[PDB]
Amino acid sequence: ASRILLNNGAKMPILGLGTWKSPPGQVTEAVKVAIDVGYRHIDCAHVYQNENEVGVAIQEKLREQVVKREELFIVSKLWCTYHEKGLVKGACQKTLSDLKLDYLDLYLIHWPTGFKPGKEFFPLDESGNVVPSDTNILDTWAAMEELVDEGLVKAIGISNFNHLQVEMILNKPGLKYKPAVNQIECHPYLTQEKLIQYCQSKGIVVTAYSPLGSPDRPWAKPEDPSLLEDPRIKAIAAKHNKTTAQVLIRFPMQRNLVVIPKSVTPERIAENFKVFDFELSSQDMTTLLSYNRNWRVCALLRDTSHKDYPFH
């Protein structure tokens, strides 16, 4: 099936297009191509600094009647400098204005860590420490719930939340809406079996980010493990006459995850969508899982003192 049922009653496409690092001058066309090819889910964020350009693409394809707004599943995220109760709606509205939408299908707390509000995404003190905010995730969550009740977003969720942090939301006094989604890093070198079982058991859908290992992340090193070039994964792909990226996308799909590979390359945007015509075997799946190295690609601030750092 192409969509998975969320705990808010809505269906979410299990394949979406990532937009982190997609240059502002390239992402409009990337998203137009993605919609032409059949993508219906776009993963966005204010912090990606390209929501205006994404929104241009969405608007043109709505205009062209290639798609209807109800068929689209548009996701964005609340950046760390806006965890304060009084700033959340403003943040959402800015995202909505840039995307040129009147609602979001899903809005996530991007990271559990709140940062000092200001123009800066990563406000630091004179020593280079990130300056935290004194807001806790449970009041942030209340503010996310208001957005549902105001009609700005159809669903709310979390991202980069660990087991204990998800549990705190679930156990919030006066919890009104459960998180629909936890969007986390997930691929064969970081399989996250425990976290995914815990979320899925609570009816929380998991989205796998960086499914190709984010080879374009700015802090990558040439020496780094490479999923795309792992000969073992190469082998499985060849067995199925698919590419290694297609296997890497199909893999979380069969774990009942949502997955959001990023590309601005039209041929890859198309290739990445052609993952509904083959099946990995249970053995292929277990073998892929066996490659876990607990290797996390996307996380800076590893030495942060932030009380809500999720990866200790």
Which among 48, 82, 209, 309 is annotated as catalytic? Answer: 48
- Ranked by CB distance to ligand NAP, the top (closest) residue is 18
What does the alpha-carbon distance between residue 255 and residue 42 come to, in Å, rounded to a whole number?
20
Q: Contact between 115 and ligand NAP (CB under 6 A)?
A: no
Q: Is 91 helix (H, G, I), strand (E, B) or coil?
A: helix
Binding site partner of 210, from ligand NAP, ligand ZST, none, Cβ cut-off 5-8 A by kind: ligand NAP
- Ranked by CB distance to ligand ZST, the top (closest) residue is 301
Q: Contact between 131 and ligand ZST (CB under 6 A)?
A: no
- Considering only residues 240 to 299 of the shown chain, the ones binding ligand ZST according to CB under 6 A are 298-299
Number of residues that bind ligand NAP (CB under 6 A): 29
Tell me if 296 is assigned to a ligand binding site: no
Binding site partner of 3, from ligand ZST, ligand NAP, none, Cβ cut-off 5-8 A by kind: none
Tell me if 13 is assigned to a ligand binding site: yes
Alpha helices per DSSP H over 18-99: 24-37, 51-63, 85-99
Question: Which of 133, 183 has the CB closer to ligand NAP?
Answer: 183
Tell me if 215 is assigned to a ligand binding site: yes
**Residue in 20, 39, 107, 251 binding ligand ZST, rule: CB under 6 A:** 20
Binding site partner of 56, from ligand ZST, ligand NAP, none, Cβ cut-off 5-8 A by kind: none
| CA 226 vs CA 26, 45, 303: distances in Å | 25, 26, 24
Catalytic: 291? no
Torsion over CA: 208, 212, 213, 216 (sign): negative
Q: Contact between 306 and ligand ZST (CB under 6 A)?
A: yes
Q: Contact between 79 and ligand NAP (CB under 6 A)?
A: no
What does the alpha-carbon distance between residue 79 and residue 47 come to, in Å, rounded to a whole number?
6
**Residue in 30, 45, 196, 237 binding ligand ZST, rule: CB under 6 A:** 45
Binding site partner of 263, from ligand NAP, ligand ZST, none, Cβ cut-off 5-8 A by kind: ligand NAP
What does the alpha-carbon distance between residue 242 and residue 41 come to, in Å, rounded to a whole number?
23
Q: How many CB atoms lie within 10 A of CB 110?
A: 20
Beta carbons within 8 Å of 42's beta carbon, 6+ residues apart = 16, 17, 19, 31, 34, 54, 58, 72, 73, 74, 75
Binding site partner of 47, from ligand ZST, ligand NAP, none, Cβ cut-off 5-8 A by kind: ligand ZST
Binding site partner of 95, from ligand ZST, ligand NAP, none, Cβ cut-off 5-8 A by kind: none
| CA triple 133-177-254, angle to 5 deg | 100
**Residue in 215, 225, 286, 293 binding ligand NAP, rule: CB under 6 A:** 215
Contact characters 138-177, ligand NAP, x per CB under 6 A: ---------------------xx-----------------
What does the alpha-carbon distance between residue 308 and residue 132 come to, in Å, rounded to a whole number?
10
Beta bridge partners of 259: 15, 208
**Residue in 28, 76, 113, 207 binding ligand ZST, rule: CB under 6 A:** 113
Q: Which of 260, 211, 270 is nearest to 19 (CA)?
A: 260
How large is the greatest C-alpha to C-alpha distance in the chain, in angstroms?
55
| CA triple 186-192-194, angle to 5 deg | 150
Residues lying near ligand NAP in the complex (CB under 6 A) are found at 18-21, 43, 110, 159-160, 183, 209-216, 228, 245, 260-265, 268, 271-272, 298
**Active site (catalytic) residues:** 48
Binding site per annotation, positions for substrate: 110
